[PDB]
Write a protein that binds this ligand. Structure first.
Ligand code: GTX
Ligand code: GTX
Lengths: 219, 221
């Protein structure tokens, strides 16, 4: 089983949980609880840049979110059929990571900047990101973003649509193709299982979880 | 068919690593320099930019926005992305650390002036204690001239571009890392990289206040 090293929170590990579960791959997590837990990994030389996420997979200790995502994606045939398809995939999911990063760090945003940061995020969802991905689906009329077959791009976009719904459920309302994609992807047997109660899917970060973050990661 | 065409302002910014990679692969490219917010809006109105931003690289009939999307395509196309998926994973792990450090150094100029000195000091601490030792450890683990697969890869190129920027920041930082210095020298001596480092190539200067002001105006920040 791949083994995911992170704390018990979404943070930078959640896109990897979604991808493994989507690919039908059982994984184990080793939850970090304290700074001491983190220091153990560093001391044991598990972490190339002293940071998590780290995924143990196939005798590698893969730190850096994208390094394990790319490797999981190629291994399980979710990175398209050739390097041109991979280029479209990487362009789509990097815009996804961009929006994703804004939402991810919103909890950590200095309190006097939170209002403006939220407003910006909602503005970009509506005017920049959602229109870009609706354009894609409209262009080809197909069920999947790339190559008319399931890829990473679909899973990462659907994960983002959940986080967008938690922010403001109206934001997707003018984007019918994005809504239909969320439904279709959420009904694929693996994703459906991941979305059910009691899965390893993680909740939004609350105040307690955030305080655990500051103690583990020393910030 | 056609040369790749790089769409960016006339500065390092987020395009310089791609400039580095293409010239290392021995690939001739054209640049189209955005000079104004009006230039950028024409790209947008024209439909050239998926998320209304640059870098954009026109290659092999695609208009690739997102730095990593064109870099990954270029690395794979010219056999600078390892020989298999496990090599690509060591490569990606390495270059993402490079990218995290590169980002810190890139955005340095846009820091509030009362934050600048502590940020500079954090950056230099991370170089000495986090990043340089990690890459020195890699070279020493195998003793080979390249980071991955004993064959030139994009990881050597991105790392050595990054060595050049740390040298501009503080030339002593690298001084306790002999294998990194050796790498810089060997990679700089590859025919293609040597030509790129010579006067008059596409290689871009450090960004001055004048260029940052052009950035503020063009990208509206
Ligand atoms: C809601 C915020 C989520 C929790 C904190 C951020 S993730 C933990 C942090 N890890 C990273 O920043 C890794 C970044 C790296 N670019 C990646 O994508 O893996 C860390 O180990 N920090 C310890 C350190 O840098 O020393
Ligand atoms: C210290 C100053 C450094 C200047 C760097 C700005 S790069 C220009 C900026 N582009 C991006 O942020 C693209 C980010 C994307 N993640 C990528 O890697 O390509 C842009 O088009 N912005 C316009 C927009 O987002 O509307």
């Amino acid at each position: 089983k791949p083994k995911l090293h992170y704390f018990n929170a979404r943070g930078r590990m959640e896109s990897t949980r979604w991808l493994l579960a989507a690919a039908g791959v059982e994984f184990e997590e080793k939850f970090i609880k304290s700074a001491e837990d983190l220091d153990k990994l560093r001391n044991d030389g598990y972490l190339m840049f002293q940071q998590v996420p780290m995924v143990e997979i196939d005798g590698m200790k893969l730190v850096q979110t994208r390094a394990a995502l790319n490797y999981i994606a190629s291994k399980y045939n979710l990175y398209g059929k050739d390097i041109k398809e991979r280029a479209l995939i990487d362009m789509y999911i990097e815009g996804i990571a961009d929006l994703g990063e804004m939402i991810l760090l919103l909890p950590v945003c200095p309190p006097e900047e939170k209002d403006a940061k939220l407003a910006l995020i909602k503005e970009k969802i509506k005017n920049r990101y959602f229109p870009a991905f609706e354009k894609v689906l409209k262009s080809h009329g197909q069920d999947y973003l790339v190559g008319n077959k399931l890829s990473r791009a679909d899973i990462h976009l659907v994960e983002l649509l959940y986080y967008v719904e938690e922010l403001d459920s109206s934001l997707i309302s003018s984007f019918p193709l994005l809504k239909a994609l969320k439904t279709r992807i959420s009904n694929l047997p693996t994703v459906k299982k991941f979305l059910q109660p009691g899965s390893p899917r993680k909740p939004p970060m609350d105040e307690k979880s955030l305080e655990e973050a500051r103690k583990i990661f020393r910030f």
